[PDB]
Design a protein around this ligand. Structure first.
Ligand SMILES: [Zn+2]
Ligand SMILES: [Zn+2]
Ligand SMILES: [Zn+2]
Ligand SMILES: [Zn+2]
Lengths: 40, 43, 33
């Protein structure tokens, strides 16, 4: 396993992706996943 | 043109519905990103 | 607590609930910018 902290999480209503900036190595890694975006 | 991503102010995962919901820093605070998740006990 | 893993391609959120041993986990893409 290789779990590292997320430093900052953003999401994006025009790509329907959330992006997690990872605390690892040279700082250039992210995790990204697909999401639904809506008003509650 | 492209809209920059917005910060998430609050992340809640609901074990009842198998959804995580990220509250977005946008408009009136009622916008969310939501996705399906697995929920389990560690061990 | 929220962590992500480039080996398993999963992000994991540690939930406060109950005895603190529950997690939410989901599939992700992981890549270098
Ligand atoms: Zn965008
Ligand atoms: Zn509204
Ligand atoms: Zn907590
Ligand atoms: Zn337990």
């Amino acid at each position: 396993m290789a779990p590292v902290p997320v430093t900052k999480l953003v999401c994006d209503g025009d790509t329907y992706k959330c992006t997690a900036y990872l605390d690892f190595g040279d700082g250039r890694w992210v995790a990204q996943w697909d999401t639904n975006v809506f008003h509650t």
